[PDB]
Design a binder for this molecule. Sequence first.
Ligand SMILES: [Mg+2]
Lengths: 57, 785, 49, 57, 69, 49, 63, 129, 108, 196, 276
Amino acid sequence: SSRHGQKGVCSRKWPTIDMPFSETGIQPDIIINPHAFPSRMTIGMFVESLAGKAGAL
Amino acid sequence: TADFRTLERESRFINPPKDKSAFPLLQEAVQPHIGSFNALTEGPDGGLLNLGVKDIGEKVIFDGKPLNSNSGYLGNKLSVSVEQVSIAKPMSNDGVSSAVERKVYPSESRQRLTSYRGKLLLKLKWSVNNGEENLFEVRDCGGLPVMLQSNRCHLNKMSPYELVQHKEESDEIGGYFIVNGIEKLIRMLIVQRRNHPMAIIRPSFANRGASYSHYGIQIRSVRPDQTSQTNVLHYLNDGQVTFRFSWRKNEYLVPVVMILKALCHTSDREIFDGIIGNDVKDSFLTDRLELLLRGFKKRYPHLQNRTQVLQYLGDKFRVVFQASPDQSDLEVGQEVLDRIVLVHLGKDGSQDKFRMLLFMIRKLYSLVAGECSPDNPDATQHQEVLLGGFLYGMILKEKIDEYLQNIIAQVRMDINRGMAINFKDKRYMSRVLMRVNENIGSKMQYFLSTGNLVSQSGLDLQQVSGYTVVAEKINFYRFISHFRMVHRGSFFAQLKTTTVRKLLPESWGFLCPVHTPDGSPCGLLNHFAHKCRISTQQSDVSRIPSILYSLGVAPASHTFAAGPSLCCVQIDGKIIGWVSHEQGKIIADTLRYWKVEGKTPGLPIDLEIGYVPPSTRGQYPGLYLFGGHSRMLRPVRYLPLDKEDIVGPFEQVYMNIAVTPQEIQNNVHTHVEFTPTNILSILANLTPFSDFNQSPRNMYQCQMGKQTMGTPGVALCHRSDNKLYRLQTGQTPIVKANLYDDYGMDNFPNGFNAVVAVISYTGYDMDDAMIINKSADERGFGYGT
Amino acid sequence: MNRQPTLHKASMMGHKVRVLPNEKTLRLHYANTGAYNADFDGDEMNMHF
Amino acid sequence: YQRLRHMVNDKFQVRSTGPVNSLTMQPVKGRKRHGGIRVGEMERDALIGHGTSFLLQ
Amino acid sequence: MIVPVRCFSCGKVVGDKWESYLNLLQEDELDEGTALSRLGLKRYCCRRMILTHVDLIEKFLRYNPLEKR
Amino acid sequence: KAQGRTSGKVPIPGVKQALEKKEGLFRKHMMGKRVNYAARSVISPDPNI
Amino acid sequence: SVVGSLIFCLDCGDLLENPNAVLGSNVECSQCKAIYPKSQFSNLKVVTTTADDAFPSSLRAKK
Amino acid sequence: SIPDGFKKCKHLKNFPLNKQQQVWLIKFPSNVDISKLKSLPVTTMTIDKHDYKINMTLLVPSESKESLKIASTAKDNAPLQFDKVFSVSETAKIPAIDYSKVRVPRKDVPKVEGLKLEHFATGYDAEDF
Amino acid sequence: SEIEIESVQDQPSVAVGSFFKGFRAPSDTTFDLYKKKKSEKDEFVLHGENERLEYEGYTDSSSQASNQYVVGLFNPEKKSIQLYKAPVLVSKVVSKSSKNLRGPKIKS
Amino acid sequence: LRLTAEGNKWRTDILKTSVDTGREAAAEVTNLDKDTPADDPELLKRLQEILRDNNKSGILDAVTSSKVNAITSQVVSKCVPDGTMKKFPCNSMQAMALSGAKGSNVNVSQIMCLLGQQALEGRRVPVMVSGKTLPSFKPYETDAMAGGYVKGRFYSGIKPQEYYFHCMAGREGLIDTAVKTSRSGYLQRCLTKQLE
Amino acid sequence: IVMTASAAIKTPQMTLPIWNDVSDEQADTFCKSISKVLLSEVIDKVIVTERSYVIHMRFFDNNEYSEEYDVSKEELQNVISNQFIHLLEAAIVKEIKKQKKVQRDRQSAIISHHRFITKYNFDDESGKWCEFKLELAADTEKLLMVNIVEEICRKSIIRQIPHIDRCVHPEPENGKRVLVTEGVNFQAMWDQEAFIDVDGITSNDVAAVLKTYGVEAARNTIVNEINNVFSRYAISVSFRHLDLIADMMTRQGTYLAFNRQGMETSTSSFMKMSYE
RNA sequence: CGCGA
Ligand SMILES: [Mg+2]
């Protein structure tokens, strides 16, 4: 889970080469479906997604 | 914007503080438990127990020797009463020989999987023939479990650097019980506001009999010893008013007029005048009232004296209270009142209890007259938290009480055996006690283990059990989650109605709205807004009346008047006097001002000021001041000055409190919340941007956070706890709330920061959805144990 | 396959078996979810053979 | 992110021969002693309604 | 518990830089930003490893069963 | 139909109570049962099957 | 003393019974034994109005 | 009877009772010194530089002045009863709220100053830009 | 307006007491005022007496702490009043023959 | 998730019309003049009165709930899709609700427009006996904002009062989800057993 | 409908199709006339003054209610005249022992009918008030009158059609023009067909219909009623199911619950035996 | 009556 209440089962450990890789070369650690939102109405996670990156930079 | 304080961080881990914890809030969180438990032995008055035992008093039995004077001589009078109670800190004697003992640190109790218990000691006065001969002998009722980090816990006062030396979590907050190595704690409950009349409407009342209405005035009176006694006034449809009380798990009913004459010598005219006051222009009350007086007369024409009344009462209940054969029904009658009616006013409140009892009847008819609205018991307005320590004392007082009963029983059987008996004999005394079974600690330890309350009276507690709950160390959050936890009790869990689990607006800033479990416990388990504090001790009211009487309060002693027509002034359920509403509002405000100002001595800020403005069919008006224990006090900011003020829930309802300074309106708000974050749980505050999430979704987080695989603690090597989870590598969340550092969750990283793409790619993460980079994992990511 | 509670017969269906290596979890295609009413949030299902 | 409890290794079981409760000569809860899986009426009802009746029975 | 050896995402080896990182914040009194950049952490992948890190082993080390107080 | 023993301690379940209440038997061990060749586990989405 | 169908001795504060219940023309306190005549007064009026809480209406449903 | 500490009043002082004179029962805070006072309104006032704001039977001494007689001015012995009641009690004054100080226009989230480019395309440094 | 203060009697002269409305005693009924000097507090207990009745009353302790009552004799022709400190007596009434009425310990 | 610059402008503007909306319904329910100011004593007297009655209080919410919901529509209608910064198909959020993939126009609205009135028992926020819906509101408040109408949107965020309101509705849902589980399940067994 | 299959329900309703002749106003009038009329409805106030006492009744204006509830002050007089007092005096003595010129003739008549009425009067012109006096023993309790009276006034019925409370001309939905009936009495409506269409009368109460129109109509009512539920929630259930259930509950020709009770008649014991 | 849809 995130801190935003998104709970999910790990679906598959995903071979890293198959995990889409950034312009930078950073494959994501976790890949959460973009469809699992509007229903759960959790914006703070998008926001955190920004700030988290924003901080780390 | 907060920071990592990484240097400041590590310097702490490296060198823990040799003076005091760096996370004071974290302590102040658990304060309700320790504040309660320490208060058992503390306070200028000698501690709750020493006050509690003082209530039990003597246990009298008679040998029955004739003396050879038909003769009214009952033999020697044995007087059995305890004197003062002490609790030794946990100590280890080495086998026998009374070799010089060593202190016991809980780390040992954990690893040995035993209870962590201090010894329990009783100074017992064995008296014969009314102090003609008396015997002081100290006893040991067995090792008593002790709350960690309390005044009887050796760990107390240790600087964090020392706890590490004694192998406890550097920040260890204690506040709980080690029982058989299991960590238990008494989860706080919610009980009716003490020392405060409650105009109740319940259908269950009408069910109790034919002429019972559903109306009632319930009050929950609690002695300074924290024993709670309920007294309820049912309004009967015929116009009778039956005082109801409870004793030995049994309900009993009394005509209220009987009791008024029982309390104080008084004239019927005075009672009537004592209620109606200036309201004689009303027919309704008089009509209701005369049927109550003419009711008591000609129901009981053989009672022309308060004494006769007292005698009559004793006549009935002497059986009930097991009164000693010497005690006259006059004498017993006096006890019945003293041990039941409005206990919080003490044995000397006889003249006060009379007034208070009139006040209810006044209010009751008003409720029946519908002039005042009923009072929601579910409403946090009328509620108070019942601390663990106080409960743990209550039970203990019961066991002590029953213990004396056990002694007298041993003697009577020893008497009815006809065996030769000398009360003055010291060896005989020992002969009795050695035969007597005294281990209280085990019984208490039994309690904490089972959480099953076993008592002669239910302690005015609806449910019988569920009082203890295991401390769960899964993550750190779930652990601390317990100490901010509270609920109404399991009896309300089974109720079909869900109104009890409603998010009443009265919980603002007290019960965190966000943090509750889901499913069946939802709406029951609640958590205090992290700034919510509980009053663990009394506050001095000594000079309050002096202040009040100075402020224009007409003494309740004289100046008969009553009714919602004009304000009433009370302290912890004691009528000080009466004022016009307009005056009271000026008073309560002024008083509120001085309270914060602080320059006026004898007026502590924690005192609630309960001013109830008069209204149309609203709550019964008045001015209420609750300084006692177990109040929900929370901080606010006071606008006329700028200073911290403290606010109870009861008084919150009427106070206009702006959330943020920008919302302050002219002549509207007298107060403002410091930060709006003050209304949230620990975890609630921790959820980032929780205002952006959907509320039911945040509400999971609080429940998810408590289920995480976290860092339970650093003591793992020395902790023997059964089943334990630990996340191998935690990370400080970049996105953070300032409280995260204040509460110092740094010491317990609950998770990691993950590079996350919100995308539909693999297709394997459709429903639940969770794709983990494989290589990322194998790098140790999220590795648990 | 069965997902409790079983509201209606479609909540219990037969399935051809494909044996998948490497993992400890039953695993479904999505078309079944609407029937079983299964969200893949800690969901469990009873397999009968 | 927060790794939770409720790891799958804690939750699953299969094919309980062993327990065979003495009264009913039937299996027992899985847990960690080798139980089985309860069926129950709502599951029974489906079989009847589901269609897999011979099988179900 | 202790410094992760590799950046999860990047795979880059982050395990060594920690000591030097503390050194930077300590001695040089840099910000958090530059030190990382000075350590040569470009990808915010490998930056969060050190940046967010906690040495919680330090607290563990305080409990040593193998020695007197 | 049994007299109260010490008004508490609970009555020991009689034969009638074994059959009836809330199960007591028929709907415990008859109308439903624990079975063999059955496995409960966690579902995982696999689109590829 | 005597207010709203209630009758009190001025010595004792007793509430006093039906004036007519006494055969003799004097009313004596039960506690103080203070004696009053039977009727110093005719039975007093005691107006009692029904409240407005009760009933539905057309007009109270309006006004 | 006479309980402990009680010395019965031996000689009671004089109470010169009798448009006639008026009789006023008036409350005061005990802290107020009534022995030194002068005027009084007929409402609010000030006493000792502090400011202040504004059923029962009366007993008169015996002629012996060791005991108490009821107050009756009717000569009917019908009880003389209190003419006027003025409750002189402690008012206090309250500071007014200063809205200009306390009502504070919101301060926006402080922008973090000195944020350069951390990100650069593959194969380039900070200096190149 | 303004009211001149002629006199303040700081020694007992008169006293105020409370029974009920309409409470009346015979003319010969007198009252025995008892006085303790207790700390600074002056606690007055009043024993009233008549033939068949007993009037017993006493000042409240808690009230007289911060409360002070002064009755006064006001000349309306003048602006002056004669101020006299007086106590406030919480009081009750007992008839002697009704007083000692009592029952036995146990009814058998 | 973002509206365009103009969209927010539309959003704000329509919201500004919602101010007096609360006072209006009261004037209507009280049968007082529509222009009765918020503080009128007879207004409050009736508001004080209508509070004490549960039934009449149920009426006031229904009326007000109507009017404010009309406001909500005017927003969502005028704003989405029109004022949205990224447009369908390029806008994913719309593309999901629209295609019925996941979510609904409601969800997208609450994110990009406002949450709107919080229905509790079909009524608005309960009211403390003081006549305050919440410690931060004047007693017997005529504002819709104080009555649970939420002008905030999850994208921009919600004021604390709104939040505490919105937490209520949340609890109502969760409680209701639990009880729906048990109730119906008992019913079905009655049918099956006899119709087996 | 299903488990309890209770005869008495929370909301008994009678759907009353009206023709298109009767006007909306006409409909309203009929609904008011055939509704519920209580004495406590029209009473503005009541005063009790005390051994005897007098009872005043302030009503609304004779026009108002006789317009509003369509009440002849005479029947109103009569409503008060006989039943009302008989009700009144009843609980009175009941409680007592529990504790151990046009007017003139009418008045004389009324007084004769009862023990406790020694005087009577009424407003025979403006109808505004009713006033009368009751006497009791010189030794009698103070027992609360107003509560007795307020209790009777509410129980007191002026005009009611048995089991039918107050109707509410709903809106003529879906082109269908209907009066909604609270409570169920069909025979009552059967005299009313001058306006409504009796052949279109439908109910919300099965067992009532079964009693009146018999099993088939009752059955048809069931499918209709159940459907309304799932209709309201927009859900969709093929009538074939509802047919099966309805046809089942009617299998005995009575209206049988799915609970223990209806299950009694079943032949197979084990089903019953394993149910509850 | 705690944990999971
Ligand atoms: Mg699910």
